[PDB]
């Protein structure tokens, strides 16, 4: 049942709540339909994050800062990777050259590019999407 794909990171009740405005935060709520994105593998390993039926499309600001609203620029293309720690990893190929891979702050928001490298465990996101099992 491919639908609202919930994704978050860092132990603790906090979900990625996207808003048409662009300022997405780690809201710890599941009452308002604003914490779901259409995560899917567009290309071989390339997964995209688009909150179609809830918010907007993502468009990282040079990886450094994560945002989305206007258009799903290539910045939003990430390589789907999995870690043996019950978490998902997404490498922003757009900036992979700098060993930078999308990282968000559970209690801050998505914007840690300068530390998207193996520095903040926050890179290991925990997805709760409605798969087709």
């Amino acid at each position: 049942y491919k639908k609202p794909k919930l994704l978050y990171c860092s132990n603790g009740g906090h979900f990625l709540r996207i808003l048409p405005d662009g300022t997405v935060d780690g809201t710890r709520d599941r009452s308002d339909q604003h914490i779901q994105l259409q995560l899917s593998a567009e290309s071989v390993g390339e997964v995209y994050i688009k909150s179609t039926e809830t918010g907007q499309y993502l468009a990282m600001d040079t990886d450094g800062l994560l945002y989305g609203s206007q258009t799903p620029n290539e910045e939003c293309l990430f390589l789907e990777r999995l870690e043996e720690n019950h978490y998902n990893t997404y490498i922003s190929k757009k900036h992979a050259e700098k060993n930078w891979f999308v990282g968000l702050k559970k209690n801050g928001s998505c914007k840690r590019g300068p530390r998207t490298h193996y520095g903040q465990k926050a890179i290991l996101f925990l997805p709760l999407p409605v798969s087709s099992d």
Binding site: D21, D25, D29, G108
Partner: protein
């Protein structure tokens, strides 16, 4: 990141439709001014809503200042559910580019305004 800690007591008003962000003080604030100190002032901000903007009184050279400013969360309680408040502490060295020593925020929707939300909020240095 680490900005220290900030004590606060937030209450709600159902007459004018505003949340009273009554913070007590901030402790262990980062340095900025020339002397292991700074002029940190909390600038209450909000998500997209952006229906509120208050500037606290500059606290000259102090990493543990007390004041307890009254921030009026201009937004109906019924609307709060979709408004994430953000408290950023700005420095006022008065020489260099005032930096954001840190900030904090919480999903209002998860903040059940039953009576008064009092707690020892942790401060983090959000690199801005």
């Amino acid at each position: 990141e680490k900005l220290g800690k900030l004590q606060y007591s937030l209450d709600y008003d159902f007459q004018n439709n505003q949340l009273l962000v009554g913070i007590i003080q901030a402790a262990e604030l980062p340095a900025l001014d020339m002397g292991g100190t700074s002029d940190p002032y909390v600038k209450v901000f909000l998500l997209p809503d952006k229906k509120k903007k208050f500037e606290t009184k500059v606290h000259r050279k102090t990493l543990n200042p007390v004041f307890n400013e009254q921030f009026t969360f201009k937004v109906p309680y019924s609307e709060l559910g979709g408004k994430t408040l953000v408290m950023a502490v700005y420095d006022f060295d008065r020489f260099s580019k005032h930096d954001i020593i840190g900030e904090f925020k919480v999903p209002m929707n998860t903040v059940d305004f039953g009576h008064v939300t009092e707690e020892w909020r942790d401060l983090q240095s959000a690199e801005k």
